[PDB]
Design brief:
Largest sheet of chain A: none
Helix content of chain A: 10-25%
Structural class of chain A: alpha+beta
Region (Disordered) (chain C): 16-38
Distance between the termini of chain A: 28 Å
Protein name (chain C): Spike protein S1
Order of helices and strands of chain A: HEE
Largest interface: A-C, 31 and 27 residues
Number of helices of chain A: 1
Oligomer: part of a larger assembly
Chain lengths: 49, 49, 49
């Protein structure tokens, strides 16, 4: 659970290392102009397809 | 009553018209400025429509 | 297609609740009694304050 931070998604997005960046209900580049109550970060590893 | 009922009918028709703005009609949010504020135009277009 | 992929899913909540994580847009001074386009912690709009 991440909260009380200035989430700089613009730096995170423009990195070419990421192979899939798909956002639903929010455009991937306007995220830097919105404020959020709490952001949950889930992480795991799966296969490609 | 013949004079009060027309005033009440018009006031209630206007009140229903105003309340219709809080409906989503299938959009992710009824507030037009917020969906324009978080979705990019090419995909915000349908939520607007 | 079968190589592993690390996946992080960021979930954003947007309830009628206090916001805490905000994109790092610098704050500005407040002007009252003027028609301005405001953005209060993610709530956007145009009006006189």
């Amino acid at each position: 659970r991440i909260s009380n931070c200035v989430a700089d998604y613009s730096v995170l997005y423009n990195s070419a290392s990421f192979s899939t960046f798909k956002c639903y209900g929010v455009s991937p580049t306007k995220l830097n102009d919105l404020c959020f109550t709490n952001v949950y970060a889930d992480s795991f590893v799966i296969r490609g397809d | 009553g013949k004079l009060q009922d027309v005033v009440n009918q018009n006031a209630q028709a206007l009140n229903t018209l105003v309340k219709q703005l809080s409906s989503n009609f299938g959009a992710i949010s009824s507030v037009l400025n917020d969906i324009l504020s978080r979705l990019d135009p090419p995909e915000a277009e349908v939520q607007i429509d | 297609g079968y190589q592993p992929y690390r996946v992080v899913v960021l979930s954003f909540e947007l309830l009628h609740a206090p916001a805490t994580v905000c994109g790092p847009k610098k704050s500005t001074n407040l002007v009252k009694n003027k028609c301005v386009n405001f953005n209060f912690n993610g709530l956007t709009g145009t009006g006189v304050l």
